[PDB]
Symmetry: C3
Subunit: 334 residues, 3 copies
């Protein structure tokens, strides 16, 4: 029935985001995406702790999908025979059938094609949700990402002015539940199935062992720090499919923040810390004013420093002594 132009997208791994227009002169299209599920054992910390991950496209989070209001999003979800479990996909951006979950349950060896109309603007979670107790388990195993549905005129500040970002990053935060043995060491398992009983017992106690960005402690640091220049406006999309988070850019602010993540609402301005409700994505933009290192954290600092939830930005440019200066360096007290 639907006679619109088709456009394929090549997804890219987080924290990067596939190329897209903000404001566009294009009308509605069918935008085609493919997600291939991968179950795999991964390392999640600098001590070598392992984890039975379940992923869309091999990454935690799954990749960010970007479309415009009124596009139709046509996703081919593939569950190769090399996996062990059934999986599906639920888009919080979509209307009907449990977000798509009730139309996309696929066994290993199967694929399915779902299309949904992007009638709601904002950033939104997508996640697997097979049914029953499997729902939380697949999500906290890594099976979640986000989609961004932009207005065709791009973003605005609510107050008729345009808000154009120079770059966008997607920070997906993952609460992980890795059981410990009697010694107190993290356990390793041979399969997701074998991890399930211990993992569920821990999950129900509601305290994660690890809280990470991009799948691992330190993932968004060093060579893989986020980057900017003084003068650049950066959009940071943050998602958490299961548990609340409170993002904060140390040394910066949220100049324009949609903490509930939905562009039909004006952004708030000048925030220190914002709040991502578990089961949602939000977004914050900041124009960098100072060079140097920044940390981007959840501002439960225990989670940030001790459980994994810290990213870095490395920012180039000229220091602004008007905004901040060390008037007197450390010295002996007179």
């Amino acid at each position: 029935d639907l006679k619109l132009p088709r456009q394929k997208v090549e997804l890219v791994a987080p924290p990067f985001v596939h190329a897209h227009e903000q404001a566009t002169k294009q009308g509605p299209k069918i935008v085609e995406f493919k997600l291939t599920i991968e179950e795999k054992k991964v390392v999640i910390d600098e001590k070598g702790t392992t984890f039975q991950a379940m992923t869309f496209n091999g990454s935690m989070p799954g990749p960010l999908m970007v479309v415009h209001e009124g596009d139709y999003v046509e996703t081919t979800l593939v569950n190769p025979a090399t996996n062990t479990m059934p999986h599906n996909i639920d888009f919080h951006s979509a209307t009907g059938a449990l977000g798509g979950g009730a139309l996309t349950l696929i066994n290993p060896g199967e694929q399915v094609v779902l299309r949904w109309k992007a009638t709601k603007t904002g950033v939104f979670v997508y996640h697997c949700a097979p049914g029953g107790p499997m729902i939380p388990w697949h999500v906290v195993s890594g099976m979640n990402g986000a989609v961004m549905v932009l207005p065709r005129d791009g973003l605005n500040d609510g107050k008729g002015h345009a808000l154009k970002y120079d770059k966008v990053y997607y920070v997906g935060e993952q609460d992980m539940y890795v059981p410990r043995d009697e010694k107190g060491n993290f356990k390793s398992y041979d399969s997701p199935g074998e991890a399930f009983t211990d993992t569920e017992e821990m999950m129900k106690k509601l305290i994660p062992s690890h809280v990470v960005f991009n799948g691992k402690v330190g993932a968004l640091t060093g060579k893989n720090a986020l980057t900017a220049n003084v003068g650049e406006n950066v959009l940071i999309v943050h998602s958490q499919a299961n548990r609340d988070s409170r993002p904060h850019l140390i040394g910066g602010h949220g100049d324009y923040v949609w903490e509930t993540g939905k562009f039909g609402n004006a952004p708030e301005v000048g925030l220190e810390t914002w709040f991502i409700r578990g089961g949602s994505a939000g977004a914050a933009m900041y124009k960098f004013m100072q060079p140097g290192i920044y940390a981007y954290v959840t501002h439960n600092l225990i989670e940030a420093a001790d459980l994994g939830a810290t990213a870095h930005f490395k920012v180039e440019g000229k220091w602004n002594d008007d905004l901040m200066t060390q008037v007197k360096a450390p010295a002996e007290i007179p």
Copy 2:
């Protein structure tokens, strides 16, 4: 002194809400309600776990009371001699005397009559609050409900347009603390008093054993699923007297949401997930667009699927293939 017309309300058990007008041509009235406290042992899960509940009117949550701005709410609170503890009531909608708590402490065998003027619009928690450590204990035992104070002109979107609901449901969420024995089985107690010491020890550790809607796992499912038709605008009032929640309608949205619950503020639009602060009520309206089953959850999915916090909607009507369609059913990967 107060010479206004009196109107009695017949309260109904949640999730239903007693009949009321949205917009009204009535002026201020004294609206009369009766709440009768019931302490009782109840079953809270499908395994037969029991719980020493304390309730207003026999239900968890207590019933929703609905009035209009400027009405006077006159409540007869009754504590029959068949109960064991003193109780009172604190309305977050009311001004003075600890919400009414300091004027309503009644022993078993007593009743009291409190009147308060509804000067603040929104949905608000009411709860028992006897004093000291008894406050949390009575609340987490079930002694909480909500009141809705509507503008006399009904609801609006902040942007001069009316927002009329076709039906309203009240979802009260309850965090419950049921201790376990050494075996690991939930304990049963002969009285609230006997449950207190173990229950308080658990409460202070801040992790519930159960998180339920309408008093029990599965209460708002099956025969007791919530219902709608495509085209119907449904208001969902959600309260949590002690602990945060993050509501989400799986397969839908919050079209208009007052997450802080107060109608003097415009609603936010197009939300995926919203946030009910512990100690508050919020409200979300959605116009259903697709038939089928929806789940209404807190989007800590562990709480939703594993601890009890899932309701269903069953929606009748015609499927909309424009909004969503299964382009290709599950098939072998080529």
Copy 3:
């Protein structure tokens, strides 16, 4: 370079706030503050539990600093040789160098002078952040306070009208992690260093032993209750540097609330309970309408009543029977 008038402030201990103007005809100044770090063992509850505290100026929270937009805040941070650890300061109000942390690390026996321009209005956290795992530890040991950056025209309601407070209080909420021995009694330690290993193990489990206002259970009660009169508009600044909170004034409301704490955004009106994201400050104003005792709590009532997080207001004035009245005192049920 910077040729502006200098003004010294004499800080005062919380919950009080140093004298300041709301609206002002002054232009930008360099406003000079001194903070002297004190490590000390303190008592945190009515049972005599002790705690290895680390503080700015001897208090938990650190004192509230108040300036106006466009002022330059010049802080002399002093770490006397009587302390054992290095410390620094990070202002969420400031731009660059990790909020100032990267320019203020001082060993015992040293001081440093940092200046930052107050370009963002609102209430903001400041805290120590030495590096790595020390960050959460210093914060949850007490090393956090707040700064308020007022518009030069004072506060407004977003809807061109001025919002002038008669008094302001600063409530700093502190999550504390005191380990227990095998008996189940709280442990005492001879130094912060000696407390670290046990304290960090507990911190990572994310459940505080105590949640207090102004450093101790009952600090803002009795002789030290907050006070007001009927007719007075009181601003309550609330901060939490590490963990969420949900403030509520029992028997009152938040008439005007900036829960994210930033004055470039209009306040919300008529709230029951608001939400302070961990890592932030917020503010609420209320005009008292009734005399008597109020409790100001976090509305996780377990935290409020059982873990320490309750303050009182004692309010003088005339009872308003229109707003609330006890129609019939407790009596036997007919």
